[PDB]
């Protein structure tokens, strides 16, 4: 039929390791575009980015855009994305760390409002203030606040946390409750950690403190970051009351951009591997409230780093380094996932779309020529006429630094 979520019994897919190039990427996108957001749900999509002039690092931001639209067969049985509703804040320097979750007629995007820059780097001068922007996927004229609505959040229950903030590209709905990926700032003095639990076992230059010390942006940060969720329950009416849910401490690493999604009827979670646990952290969710993930013991997918915590490092070290390169579960019984990784050890480059299980990469294909620099990747997978497809956004330097979008059909067979 049309486009829908990855639910039910999809068309079968190749489950054997194969170095034949059987993945056929199809580009669908055609001074700097950064801070991207992609999210795909129920034939609809949310997208965001920030356009800066000059750098990508420094540099004045000319325009922040947050859009929603439809994902449809573009004509050749290949899906692409068609914008239908776009919002622009007046001041593009005040909107940060947006994340989008879909419910029925809208896409709700939760953002941080900042006049001190990125709250991660100015964490103690940032006064926590959050907003929602609600965008209709199928807008209609002269409909007041239906197409676009802006709400300032006034009531936040942070538990034991000083400040909380959305942290990640996308979240999920359960019933009429929305859960966004988030992060809590906690004073380092109030942080409870037993260094006995830091896995230093066969690590020559690790010290048991390295876990605690790496729970913030540096060893003497005032705050540690713990990932989690922000719950917004729509059946409550009144004004918006946001609640924070901290993540369980199994395989605990620094708060980082993460993503929660539904696949084959169950919620999956991915957390970016900044710090020392450089192997990919993702898995099914045992419980939502409180948040617990059963992380895969994945031995083949990691992320690029720098001197102390490079790709494939498993030893605890004091570092804040890495990239958000997520993956999407496409087959639960064999735990197969699709995602884009940067095939290099210490430099952010060489995107590679791979389909992999915990211990082996079944198949893969690059998305550029070698040494092309890359950064954040976001992948989301869905069904088109019951065939499993994935769309992936990849930050790329060409010559403009911008997000490219690819559609990748996952094959039913392994013959080249």
């Amino acid at each position, epitope marked *: 039929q049309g486009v829908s979520d990855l639910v039910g019994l999809p068309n079968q897919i190749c489950l054997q390791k194969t170095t034949s190039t059987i993945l056929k990427p199809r580009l669908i996108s055609y001074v700097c575009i950064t801070d991207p957001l992609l999210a795909v749900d129920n034939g609809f999509f949310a997208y965001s980015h920030l356009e800066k002039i000059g750098s990508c690092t420094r540099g004045i931001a000319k325009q922040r855009i947050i859009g929603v639209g439809e994902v449809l067969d573009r004509g050749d049985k290949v899906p692409s994305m068609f914008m239908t509703n776009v919002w622009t804040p007046p001041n593009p320097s005040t909107i940060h760390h947006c994340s989008s979750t879909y419910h029925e007629d809208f896409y709700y995007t939760l953002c941080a409002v900042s006049h001190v820059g990125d709250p991660i780097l100015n964490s103690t001068s940032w006064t926590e203030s959050l907003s929602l922007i609600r965008l209709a996927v199928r807008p209609k004229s002269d409909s007041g606040d239906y197409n676009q609505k802006y709400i300032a959040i006034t009531k936040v229950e942070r538990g034991k946390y000083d400040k909380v903030m959305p942290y990640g590209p996308s979240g999920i709905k359960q019933g009429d409750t929305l859960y966004f990926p988030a992060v809590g700032f906690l004073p380092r003095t109030e942080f409870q950690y037993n260094d006995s639990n830091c896995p230093i*076992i*066969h*690590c*020559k230059y690790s010290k048991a403190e390295n876990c605690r010390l790496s729970m913030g942006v540096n060893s003497k940060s005032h705050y540690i970051l713990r990932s989690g969720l922000l719950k917004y329950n729509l059946s409550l009416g009144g004004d918006i009351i946001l609640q924070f849910i901290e993540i369980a401490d199994n395989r605990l690493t620094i708060g980082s951009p993460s993503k929660i999604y539904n696949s084959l009827g169950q919620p999956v979670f991915y957390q970016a591997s900044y710090s020392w646990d450089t192997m990919i952290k993702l898995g099914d969710v045992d419980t939502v409230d409180p948040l617990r993930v059963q992380w895969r013991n994945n031995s083949v997918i990691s992320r690029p780093g720098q001197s102390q915590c490079p790709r494939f490092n*498993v*030893c605890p070290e004091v570092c804040w380094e890495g990239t958000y390169n997520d993956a999407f579960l496409i087959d639960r019984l064999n735990w197969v996932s699709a995602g884009v990784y940067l095939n290099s050890n210490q430099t952010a480059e060489n995107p590679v779309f791979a389909v992999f299980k915990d*211990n082996e990469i079944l198949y893969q294909v690059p998305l550029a020529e070698d040494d092309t620099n890359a950064q954040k990747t976001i992948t989301d997978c869905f069904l088109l006429e019951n065939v499993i497809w994935c769309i992936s956004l990849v930050e790329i330097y060409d010559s403009v630094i911008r997000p490219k979008l690819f559609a990748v059909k996952i094959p039913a067979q392994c013959s080249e």
Partner: antibody
Amino acid sequence: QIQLVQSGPELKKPGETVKISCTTSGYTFTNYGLNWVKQAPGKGFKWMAWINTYTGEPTYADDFKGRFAFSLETSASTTYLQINNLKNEDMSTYFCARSGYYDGLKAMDYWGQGTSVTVSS
Amino acid sequence: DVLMIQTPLSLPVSLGDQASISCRSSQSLIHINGNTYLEWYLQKPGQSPKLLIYKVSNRFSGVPDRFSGSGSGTDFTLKISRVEAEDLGVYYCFQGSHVPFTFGAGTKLELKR
């Protein structure tokens, strides 16, 4: 001539404190860590702790916390297992064994001869 | 903790026959750095244990080619291809992937009669 050499057998009363020694030679002390293993009479083996010879920090099992102390003297190129507050269920043979880091081989290639701890009043 | 089931626990052999020990695991032993740390040791009465095999299939310095280690995931097997007198003894498998590290019960390789 890589060798591990442990202190001699011990006779201790219940409640007393014993300190077993294991001295290494024939290789640079800090390029390998060291495991401690317990063998109960006529029974199998049980892993106790693994100590990092560079940092001095042990990683011990939960069953051996509190009244078990795994230390080392880097100068003497030796490691120690101390047991405080000795009880019958500690009467056993204790081996030290070489176990390298992730940089090399972490299997136990060379073992000490064992130390026997006997507990009787 | 990860349990290690060695079967069998007694292995009667005739000198020159072939023997094989199955060590099976409660949780997978594939470390997230890709190494499977399953080792086989042999202890003789009154002696230290001796390292036979490491990383599932790799023999240690000085081990006869008769000793071969196989397996993956949670099922591993030690194989002795012809049995010699200096083989008889107690065989222990050992996982080094998850803390605390654990051994098997041990298999007694004894002489048949």
